[PDB]
């Protein structure tokens, strides 16, 4: 609505200034310290600027994809993708971000691979990355056994991917509103976790463009489970 839009704008400022602080500080340090900076540190500091730019790029791509999905100008080119491979490549991309928060990234499969499916690989990779990122971002604060498990399964003439976690959990009053645009569960736990409230709004629209659905089951303290069903066949 509006009160949300305002919070949303403030959230963009917050999430975007975190990598900018790094980019700006590391660059000025390299500039001011060329005389007292060995080669491996220079390369390391350069790598931070490059990595922090890539995260900053991904957040801008979230804003762009949302505006395209709002305007209804985003396509969906389907093809014969191996889904068992596609989840694994998505998990490899998160492994670095997962290691920062002490999160394990499991992939189990009930049906035997390879799992054939007629979907857009780029957009389903974006769906999985969003759910995997939320698993890491909204995990427990101090725990030794924090994980994000992706369970692949085949059901109802489709493909049922489940993203399980043992994180903070979602209350029942928020369980409906989590998929809305700009919505975030405002609490004492999630006060310092960055986010716009667009990820699940982008994920719901992408999944529903494929003729599929997404829903959630969660308990506060225990964890959350995100189920996403998509059809297999063309016709």
């Amino acid at each position: 609505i509006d009160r949300m839009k305002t919070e949303f704008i403030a959230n963009i400022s917050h999430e975007l200034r975190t990598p900018l602080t790094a980019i700006k500080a590391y660059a000025e340090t390299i500039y001011n310290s060329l005389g007292e900076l060995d080669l491996s540190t220079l390369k390391e500091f350069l790598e931070v600027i490059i990595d922090q730019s890539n995260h900053l790029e991904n957040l801008l791509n979230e804003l762009l994809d949302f505006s395209r999905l709002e305007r209804k100008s985003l396509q969906i080119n389907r093809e014969k993708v191996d889904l068992c491979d596609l989840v694994e490549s998505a998990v490899n991309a998160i492994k670095e971000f997962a290691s920062s928060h002490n999160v394990n990234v499991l992939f189990e499969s009930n049906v035997p691979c390879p799992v054939e499916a007629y979907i857009d690989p780029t957009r389903i990779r974006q769906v999985l990355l969003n759910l995997l990122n939320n698993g890491v971002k909204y995990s427990k604060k101090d725990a030794p056994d924090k994980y994000v498990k992706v369970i692949l399964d085949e059901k109802d003439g489709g493909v049922l991917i489940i993203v399980e976690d043992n994180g903070i959990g979602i209350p029942d009053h928020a369980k409906d509103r989590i998929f809305e645009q700009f919505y975030r569960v405002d609490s004492s736990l999630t006060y310092e976790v960055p986010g716009t409230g667009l990820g699940l709004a982008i994920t719901k629209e992408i999944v529903e463009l494929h003729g599929g659905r997404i829903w959630v089951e969660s308990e506060v303290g225990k964890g959350s489970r995100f189920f996403v069903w998509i059809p297999k066949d063309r016709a």
Binding site: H14, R17, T18, L20, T21, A22, K24, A25, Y26, E28, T29, N32, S33, E36, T41, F45, V48, Q52, S100, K141, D142, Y191, E192
Partner: protein
């Protein structure tokens, strides 16, 4: 010679601040939340505390509060280095006992100049 307690949940932020602190000659001790910062104060008493606001377990405002109610910690200078760029956020920190507040993004040159000011006081 001078010890500096670095308090921020971001590992990337801690590294670059630690680099510029070590480049002057200051030894640093790191803490990834407010509770660890207070736990490590039992080991040693720093000459300066670089403190973040937003972080899990314990936040910077409650750290700033707890530093004053204990007698041993209340006269240690505190520079608040934070992403919160509001005026009412600054005024709360200064009232809680912080000696200076700097906004992120920050200049390492201006930050070290302010670190020199409080240590050479």
């Amino acid at each position: 010679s001078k010890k500096v307690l670095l308090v921020d949940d971001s590992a990337v932020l801690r590294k670059i601040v630690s680099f510029n602190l070590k480049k002057e000659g200051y030894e640093v001790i790191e803490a990834e939340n407010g509770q660890i910062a207070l736990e490590k104060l039992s080991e040693f008493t720093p000459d300066l505390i670089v403190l973040d606001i937003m972080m899990p377990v314990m936040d910077g405002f409650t750290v700033l509060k707890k530093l004053q109610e204990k007698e041993e910690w209340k006269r240690i200078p505190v520079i608040v280095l934070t992403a919160k760029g509001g005026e009412e956020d600054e005024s709360l920190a200064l009232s809680l006992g912080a000696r200076k507040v700097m906004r992120k993004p920050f200049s390492p040159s201006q930050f070290i100049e302010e670190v020199k000011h409080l240590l050479n006081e």
